[PDB]
């Protein structure tokens, strides 16, 4: 699995800065449970939470959203059931014609 | 206010090619109600749906995801509770400075 926003948050900010999850939650103005879920990759990053992270850490909102975007695509590429389905989808071309 | 993926789908694909909701549904292989919810913005365009649309209309997945991204950004920017809140957030640079004083 690609690097999640949670991975980046824990390994490149929290640990290097000696910052606790509860301190971050306070800085972000969200419940501790929301930060932990993000870090354990249990909840996808929302646009709103991306803005909060951008604020606290002084980055663009894009930076956080792109990490989530790459993970999202990875999840669909690796779901074989979904891939098989995309396999028999007929395009608007073959259709409009026939 | 950006054009939702639903509007692009309806006004730039379904109507110029006279393709029905039900017709697109059977192509995407999803229930008619999912397509209708996408078009009316009651359901966000998901990553999987983006893959299906990409396949049916021969586009990239991001062509669709970028449209939903624009809507997501608009929603946050026009939510006053969130904006005031974002305005009150203390940065980590500030916080760490304060913490070291204690």
What CATH number is given to the structural domain containing A88? 1.10.260.40
For residue B89, which residues of chain A lie inside 8 Å, CB to CB?
Answer: 27-29, 52, 55-56
What does the block give as tokens for A76? 């669909």
Which residue reads 């229930």 in tokens?
B31
Q: Do B56 and A28 touch (CB under 8 A)?
A: no
Angstrom CA distances, A97 to A34, A91, A94, B17, stand at: 50, 10, 5, 11
B17 Cβ contact partners less than 8 Å away, ≥ 6 residues apart: A92, A96
Q: How far apart are the first and last CA of chain B?
A: 46
Interface mutation vs chain B, best among A30, A89, A90, most B CBs within 10 Å = A89
**Phi (first) and psi of residue B32, to 5 degrees:** -55, -35
**Rounded Cα gap, residues B26 and B28, in angstroms:** 6
Does one domain contain both B46 and B96? no
**Rounded Cα gap, residues A38 and A5, in angstroms:** 7
Q: Which of A82, A91, A93 sits opposite B48 (nearest CB)?
A: A82
Report the number of distinct structural domains present in chain B. 2
For residue B52, which residues of chain A lie inside 8 Å, CB to CB?
Answer: 86, 89
Structural domain range at position B96 = 80-102
Nearest CA distance, A32 vs chain B (angstrom) = 15
Asked if B61 and B51 touch (Cβ cutoff 8 Å), the reply is: yes
Q: Give helix B80-88 / helix A47-57 axis angle, nearest 10°.
A: 20
Q: Which of A16, A11, A12, A38 is nearest to A25 (CA)?
A: A38
**Rounded Cα gap, residues A86 and B29, in angstroms:** 9
Q: Do A51 and B76 touch (CB under 8 A)?
A: yes
Overall resolution, Å = 2.2
Does one domain contain both B88 and B72? no
A27-64 burial, b at 16+ Cβ within 10 Å, e below that, comes to bbebeeeebbebbeeeebbbbbbbbbbbbbbeeebeeb
**Rounded Cα gap, residues B40 and B8, in angstroms:** 11
DSSP state of B44: -
Q: Do B47 and A73 touch (CB under 8 A)?
A: yes
Q: How far is CA B16 from the centre of its chain?
A: 23
Which residue reads 């792109």 in tokens?
A66
Does one domain contain both B50 and B2? yes
Does one domain contain both B73 and B85? no
A80-86 CB contacts, 8 Å cutoff, 24+ apart: A82/B48, A82/B51, A85/B29, A86/B51, A86/B52, A86/B55
């Amino acid at each position: 699995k690609p690097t999640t926003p949670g991975d980046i948050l824990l390994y490149e900010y929290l640990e290097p800065l000696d910052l606790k999850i509860n301190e971050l939650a306070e800085l972000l103005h969200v419940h501790r449970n929301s930060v932990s879920a993000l870090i354990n990759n249990n909840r996808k990053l929302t646009t709103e939470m991306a803005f909060r992270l951008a604020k606290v850490f002084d980055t663009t909102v894009d930076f956080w959203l792109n990490l989530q975007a790459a993970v999202d695509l990875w999840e669909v590429e690796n779901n074989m059931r979904t891939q098989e389905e995309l396999g028999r989808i007929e395009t608007v071309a073959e259709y409009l014609a026939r």
